[PDB]
């Protein structure tokens, strides 16, 4: 590493080299945090986490008990040991608390003054973070499994919602229009994710073992349907062209948005060319998941090699996205891990699981 510092000082290597190499080294040295703790307030398992995209300071967490906790991740104390204190809380005494489990919570991109939370109580609530009051509510005829706002859209502000209905809802936060729907799936839509690269590209994964990419501006259904075999087993499109041999319960675009990682209940993760949905045949081995709802997993950013952190039983499996090589198992949870969210500023990880714990993984040394 002194070689890295010397090369940076002497201009031999771009500082990009040291930055991404050290980010990768930090991610590889991920371990149970020696001096850090997260305050425990959820009475039930944490189903979702979200660190705000700008300044990466505050973290939302939705629990199976319906409460939403807002934590400050910064060590505002002077000690090396600190607990991520809870700033705010939609608790059981809040007038607008979710009646059932909160399954997805997401900070509004471009601004930390608002966030959103969808629950199995058939509601997508939009909260003002300052007053901590519901600015809006969208009701659905069937329970919400996931939702996502575009991390890129300066123009549109649509929330793509996947419920147990076979339709992907698009709720306009600009003047409230939840009527827009996308047809083409056949069972519950367990995951939805906007492309970080393209403004109007949305990937939706449903229990019909299919993943569809939509240009929501378009009037002609999905753009691409992901196919495991790319055409080896080709059939007229009524039941073929499946992404997995089970329910596809998780989506994640890579950092650049040029590839898509789909995890399904066939104990398989697959990497897809996001421009034509071709399977890249990256192996990843066996990725154990049996979740009946959406599975939240994230990818690394700002590193020499991209990593993907997938909940794997009661562990976090870290894989290399483009080679599939298994990095490691982060092993500190006592029950199945529901979500993991990656802090890209310091290569940190926060994992929420059914054991009512949010565990922080920090690079060692």
In the window 11-30, what residues touch other proteins (CB under 8 A)?
A: 11-12, 14-20, 22, 25
C-alpha to C-alpha distances, 77 to 31, 80, 357, nearest whole angstrom: 22, 8, 22
Work out which of 225, 314, 326, 328 binds other proteins, going by CB under 8 A: 314
For other proteins, the binding residues in 32-71 under the rule CB under 8 A are 32-33, 37, 40, 43-45, 47, 55-57, 64-65
The CB-of-299 to other proteins minimum distance in angstroms stands at: 11
For other proteins, the binding residues in 271-290 under the rule CB under 8 A are 273, 275
Is 81 or 176 the residue whose CB approaches other proteins more closely? 81
Contacts of 115 (CB under 8 A, 6+ apart): 50, 60, 105, 106, 107, 108, 126, 127, 129
Residues 276, 280, 281, 284: what is their CA dihedral angle, to the nearest 10 degrees? -120
Give the residue ranges of DSSP H helices in 197-275: none
The CB-of-106 to other proteins minimum distance in angstroms stands at: 18
How far apart, in whole angstroms, are the C-alpha atoms of residue 185 and residue 142?
15
The CB-of-322 to other proteins minimum distance in angstroms stands at: 6
The reply to whether 137 sits near other proteins by the rule CB under 8 A is: no
* Number of Cβ atoms within 10 Å of the Cβ of 293: 19
* Greatest distance between any 2 Cα atoms in the chain: 64
For other proteins, the binding residues in 330-359 under the rule CB under 8 A are 331-332, 334-336, 344-346, 354-357, 359
The CB-of-195 to other proteins minimum distance in angstroms stands at: 10
* Number of Cβ atoms within 10 Å of the Cβ of 134: 17
The reply to whether 75 sits near other proteins by the rule CB under 8 A is: yes
Q: To 5 degrees, how large is the angle CA 98–CA 100–CA 105?
A: 60
How far apart, in whole angstroms, are the C-alpha atoms of residue 90 and residue 101?
12
For other proteins, the binding residues in 174-233 under the rule CB under 8 A are 196-197
Judged by CB under 8 A, the stretch of 129-137, 174-182, 205-213, 251-259 that binds other proteins is: 251-259
The reply to whether 153 sits near other proteins by the rule CB under 8 A is: no
Identify the burial level of 311 via C-beta atoms within 10 angstroms of its C-beta, where 0-12 means exposed, 13-18 middle and 19 or more buried: buried
Is 137 or 258 the residue whose CB approaches other proteins more closely? 258
Work out which of 241, 255, 262, 298 binds other proteins, going by CB under 8 A: 255
On whether the CB atoms of residues 13 and 4 are closer than 8 A, the answer is yes
Is 57 or 180 the residue whose CB approaches other proteins more closely? 57
Nearest partner of 279 among 313, 304, 248, 306, judged by Cα: 248
Phi, psi of 328 (to 5 degrees): -165, 170
The CB-of-230 to other proteins minimum distance in angstroms stands at: 13
Q: Count residues binding other proteins (CB under 8 A).
A: 76
What is the number of residues in the chain? 365
The reply to whether 293 sits near other proteins by the rule CB under 8 A is: yes
The CB-of-120 to other proteins minimum distance in angstroms stands at: 5
Work out which of 5, 181, 288, 329 binds other proteins, going by CB under 8 A: 5
For other proteins, the binding residues in 95-124 under the rule CB under 8 A are 99-101, 120-121
Is 183 or 346 the residue whose CB approaches other proteins more closely? 346
Is 133 or 290 the residue whose CB approaches other proteins more closely? 290
Q: Give me 208's structure tokens.
A: 């019909």
């Amino acid at each position: 590493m002194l070689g890295f510092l010397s090369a940076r000082q002497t201009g031999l290597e771009d500082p990009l080299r040291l930055r991404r190499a050290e980010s990768t080294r930090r991610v590889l040295g991920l371990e149970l945090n020696k001096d850090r703790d997260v305050e425990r307030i959820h009475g039930g398992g944490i189903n979702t986490l979200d660190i705000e995209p700008v300044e990466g300071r505050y973290m939302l967490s939705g629990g199976s008990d319906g409460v939403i906790v807002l934590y400050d991740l910064e060590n505002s104390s002077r000690q090396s040991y600190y607990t991520c204190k809870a700033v705010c809380s939609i608790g059981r005494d809040h007038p607008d608390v979710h009646r059932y489990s909160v399954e997805t919570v997401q900070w509004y991109p471009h601004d930390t003054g608002m966030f959103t939370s969808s629950s199995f109580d058939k509601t997508l609530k939009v909260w003002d973070t300052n007053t901590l009051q519901t600015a809006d509510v969208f009701n659905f005829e069937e329970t919400v499994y996931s939702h996502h706002m575009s991390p890129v859209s300066t123009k549109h502000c649509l929330v793509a919602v996947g419920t147990r209905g076979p339709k992907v809802q698009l709720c306009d936060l600009k003047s409230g229009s939840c009527s827009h729907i996308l047809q083409g799936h056949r069972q519950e839509i367990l995951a939805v994710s906007w492309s970080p690269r393209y403004d109007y590209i949305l990937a939706t994964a449903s229990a019909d073992s299919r993943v569809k990419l939509w240009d929501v501006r378009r009037a002609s259904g999905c753009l691409i349907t992901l196919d495991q075999h790319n055409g080896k087993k080709s059939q007229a499109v009524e039941s073929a062209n499946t992404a997995h041999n089970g329910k596809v319960n998780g989506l994640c675009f890579t950092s650049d948005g040029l590839h898509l990682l789909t995890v399904g209940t066939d104990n398989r993760m697959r990497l897809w060319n996001s421009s034509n949905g071709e399977n890249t045949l990256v192996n990843y081995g066996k990725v154990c998941n049996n979740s009946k709802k959406g599975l939240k997993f994230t990818v690394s950013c700002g590193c020499s090699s991209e990593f993907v952190f997938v909940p794997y039983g009661s562990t976090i499996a870290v894989y290399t996205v483009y080679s599939g090589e298994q990095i490691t198992m982060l092993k500190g949870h006592y029950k199945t891990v529901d979500c993991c969210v990656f802090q890209s500023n310091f290569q940190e990880l926060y994992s929420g699981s059914r054991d009512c714990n949010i565990l922080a993984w920090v690079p060692s040394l």
